[PDB]
Design an enzyme around this catalytic site. Structure first.
Site, PDB file in Angstrom:
ATOM      1  N   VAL B  99       0.897  -1.176   0.147  1.00 53.37           N
ATOM      2  CA  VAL B  99       0.141   0.129  -0.018  1.00 53.37           C
ATOM      3  C   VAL B  99       1.036   1.339   0.042  1.00 53.37           C
ATOM      4  CG1 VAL B  99      -1.951   1.125   1.220  1.00 53.37           C
ATOM      5  CG2 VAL B  99      -1.723  -1.202   1.356  1.00 53.37           C
ATOM      6  N   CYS B 100       0.607   2.121  -0.783  1.00 56.64           N
ATOM      7  CA  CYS B 100       1.384   3.551  -0.802  1.00 56.64           C
ATOM      8  C   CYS B 100       2.792   3.321  -0.886  1.00 56.64           C
ATOM      9  CB  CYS B 100       0.665   4.269   0.141  1.00 56.64           C
ATOM     10  SG  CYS B 100       0.897   6.020   0.580  1.00 56.64           S
ATOM     11  N   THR B 101       3.449   4.077  -0.135  1.00 55.70           N
ATOM     12  CA  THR B 101       5.016   3.922  -0.046  1.00 55.70           C
ATOM     13  C   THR B 101       5.569   2.586   0.632  1.00 55.70           C
ATOM     14  OG1 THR B 101       4.894   4.951   2.216  1.00 55.70           O
ATOM     15  CG2 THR B 101       5.387   6.351   0.097  1.00 55.70           C
TER      16      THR B 101
END
Lengths: 226, 226
Positions: B99-101
């Protein structure tokens, strides 16, 4: 600092709480509280362990109170200490909010009498006995009361609160910082869009819980009638 | 039982984790783990306190591994113990997700070399130095790798995983039980849809973090070059 509080109770549905918590905690000049009878561990319905940060007695006057839902709502609907705390905070709060079955707790506290409200689709029949005007919409506002449906209702209404407490540009910046643009891969999030076979499976799995909550709701309604 | 593990690290963005956790924990015959160096408290970037359930050494072989993002990703990109654990689990996992970074951690572990991937919009330039083929899409699949953007990407891809591990009817039933049907009140969740003034505010606020992560990324890339 804007004071925002979430009620954190055993067998909470944690995402009802953790979604709006992470959005609202992103705002400047906000303090967020996780409230229970004493600080310390509280176990969500999944087994996730969370930590309450303040007691009822030590909680500051709140600008926003949010009641999440979950399995644990049934016990909370007959917890006189919790219901008294919610009534005390609701008296002066700018916003009184709930997610999913959290509105049944507001109902048990007497805060839905004559008010438009929603709750989880499987439990919607329990609003009228608590004095509410039941509404089949995802977010229902009536004055300073916001009730929302869906495990992520609080993410969406947290952006509305951000825009009203601050401004639209602040809400848009938080949305962009979080890259929040949901796109569910299925369209079964409402009994009106899910296949009939799926609605049957879900209703059957909720039937024992609904039966128990009918009993609790009638006792909670009797206390409001007194 | 399907074994699902989330990496839980200091300064995690907790919603990246807590969203997919509550969805996947709703499935039958699933065990969900919160993994860190030892069981015990781990503090998210908001101050929310979570609890890791297992150590690296005690974690069972996972069917699904999920790496969340957050502030804390920078330290994790140079944590040899964490990167070795991720490589060990990724070797046999049916699904490797982020997820995300969190995809920058997969990148530092060497798991994006020659793979299509995405990450948070403000950090997207860091994928190519880690050997990835950068893709500007919300969910990117390449074999058994899924990378997603947005603080709630894991909620959406958890429904995809449910459908593939079980069947579409099971995924639809979980969606309906959770009444999951998001409707954001603003349309600023992408730099392509947000007002230009908002994109500027968000870029400026991310600039110090991006500068530090450019430095970390180059050191992580040097280790992959060895």
């Amino acid at each position: 600092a804007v004071q925002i509080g979430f009620l954190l109770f055993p067998e909470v549905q944690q995402l009802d709480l953790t979604g709006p918590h992470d959005v609202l905690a992103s705002l400047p000049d906000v303090q967020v509280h996780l409230i229970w009878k004493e600080p310390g561990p509280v176990v969500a319905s999944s087994g996730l362990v969370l930590q309450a940060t303040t007691s009822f007695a030590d909680c500051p006057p709140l600008d926003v109170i949010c009641i999440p839902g979950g399995t644990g709502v049934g016990a909370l609907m007959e917890d006189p200490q919790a219901l008294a705390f919610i009534r005390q905070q609701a008296a002066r709060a700018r916003y009184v909010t709930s997610v999913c079955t959290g509105s049944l707790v507001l109902g048990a506290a007497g805060l839905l009498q004559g008010k438009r409200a929603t709750t989880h689709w499987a439990y919607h029949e329990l609003l009228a006995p608590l004095g509410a005007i039941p509404v089949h919409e995802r977010v229902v506002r009536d004055g300073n009361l916001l009730t929302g449906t869906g495990i992520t209702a609080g993410i969406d209404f947290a952006l509305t609160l951000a825009a009203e407490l601050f401004d639209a540009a602040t809400a848009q910046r938080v949305q962009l910082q979080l890259e929040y643009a949901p796109a569910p891969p299925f369209n079964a999030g409402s009994p009106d869009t899910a296949p009939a076979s799926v609605v049957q499976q879900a209703r059957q799995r909720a039937a024992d819980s609904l039966h128990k909550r009918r009993e609790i709701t009638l006792r909670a309604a009797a206390r409001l009638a007194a």
